[PDB]
Structures are given as C-alpha cells and as structure tokens.
Homo-oligomer: A and B are copies of this chain.
Amino acid sequence: MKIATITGVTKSPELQVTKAIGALILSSDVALSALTTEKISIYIERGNGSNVILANKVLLKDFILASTYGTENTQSDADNAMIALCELADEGSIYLADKESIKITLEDLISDKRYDLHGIEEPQQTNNLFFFEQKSVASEEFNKKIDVQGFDLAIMTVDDSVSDLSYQYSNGQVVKYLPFELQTLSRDIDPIQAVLSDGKVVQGLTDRLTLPLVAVVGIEINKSQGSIINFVVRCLKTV
C-alpha cells in the first residue's frame, strides 16, 4: 500500500508501518544518475527488546543497485523518471511478533523534488532478512584488505585512483583483477542496468560498480592517495 509522499522538505518524518510487507517501491522524478546525496534508513522496532537494524543511512543509489541486480532492472514512467523495487526478505515477507513494527526514514533530500514510498505484501512469512553494511578504504592509506565472507553482493565506488583488485577464494586461490576486467565481468550477468523514459537504455552507471561475490573470502584493494573508496555489501541471514 502507499506509505508516504515527500516533497518540499529536506528531511522526511519517521514513517511507521504496522503491516507485514515484503518489498518497497521507490518512485521519484529524479533520474538514477542524478541522485546525489539521498540516504535511507530502515529498521524493525520491538516493544520490549533491542531493535533490529537492516539499513543505516545507506545511499539511495547503492541501495537501488544492490537490490535490483539480475534479470530485473529499474524502470521509468511518463510521470516518474525512476521506479525501483527493493526486496527486504527472500521469497516470503517479514513475520511480525507482538509490539513489533517497521520504521523507515529518508535523509538529505532536495527541496524541489518528489519522492514516493509503496509497500508490497506477500502471501507468506519468512525468517530470512537482508542486511546492508558499509566498508570504507581511507584516502591516506595505499592498500587495504577487507573480509567479505558470507556476503553475496557488493557495490564499489568507481574512481580512477584505484589500480588493482585481488580476490581470495574459498580454496585459497588468489586472482588479480583490473577495473576494466571487473566491469566487463560484471556486465556479463546483468547487461542492462536501467531503461530511460524516452526509450534509451543504460548498461551501467559511471560512478558505481556491482560486484557479485561467489565463494569469495577476502578482497584486497591496491590504490593511490587522494580519494576514499566505499563498499556497500549485502547479506542474508535469520534474525
């Protein structure tokens, strides 16, 4: 069902959903490439316990790209320049116990734009949920190793100062990759990334890269100074 419509304000109010949903539809008149600083934060609140945080100030571009990788792609309409569907659980929907609800907030919005939220319910309830985490490589340092065991998808910020990537697999084999090779490998699973309103397609953003991780237990990044690199990693687990 329709959740909220935000316009004319920089910060969206705390939105509460008491109905068990399975996915969220984000629709806005801002094109996906034009999104700059919008952030989202979704979690599950319990009456007599600690909250369960699924996302925490995740960038809208990273959230959309992580949630729409595969056969699907973000679409458009005559009135909305961006429509995306992002699922919060595998197969079924989220099971809500007593005194349990869902809370969604939006931050860093543009004054003269529009945003909408829609909730998508399912005929089933499941215990598996999606979590989003962030890993940063600082600008001052040169190389860094980050452990991505248990994750199945990552989003890299694309920059020209990054030179080398290293993948360590489960069987201990280490493979060397370049940004060009990584982009070409990524575009062999989901060729088209988005469809524009006028009819043209875009096969990938110029500042984000979607890395599918299978049997990967580590990522080493070799770069130079002057820029900060960010990874948005997605995982599935039972709460």
Chain A interface (Cβ within 8 Å of chain B)? 1-2, 25, 27, 71-73, 75-78, 83, 85, 118, 120-124, 167, 169, 171, 173, 175-176, 178, 180-181, 183-185, 187-189, 191-192, 195-196, 198-203, 206, 215
A191 touches B195 (CB 8 A): yes
Smallest CB separation, A218 vs chain B (Å): 12
A173 touches B123 (CB 8 A): yes
B199 touches A85 (CB 8 A): no
Smallest CB separation, A29 vs chain B (Å): 14
A-B pairs with beta carbons under 8 Å apart, 10 shown:
A2-B178, A25-B181, A71-B189, A72-B187, A77-B183, A123-B215, A191-B192, A198-B200, A199-B202, A200-B200
Q: Which residue of B lies closest to A122 (CB)?
A: B175
Q: Which residue, of A2, A78, A171, A192, has the highest number of chain B Cβ atoms within 10 A?
A: A192
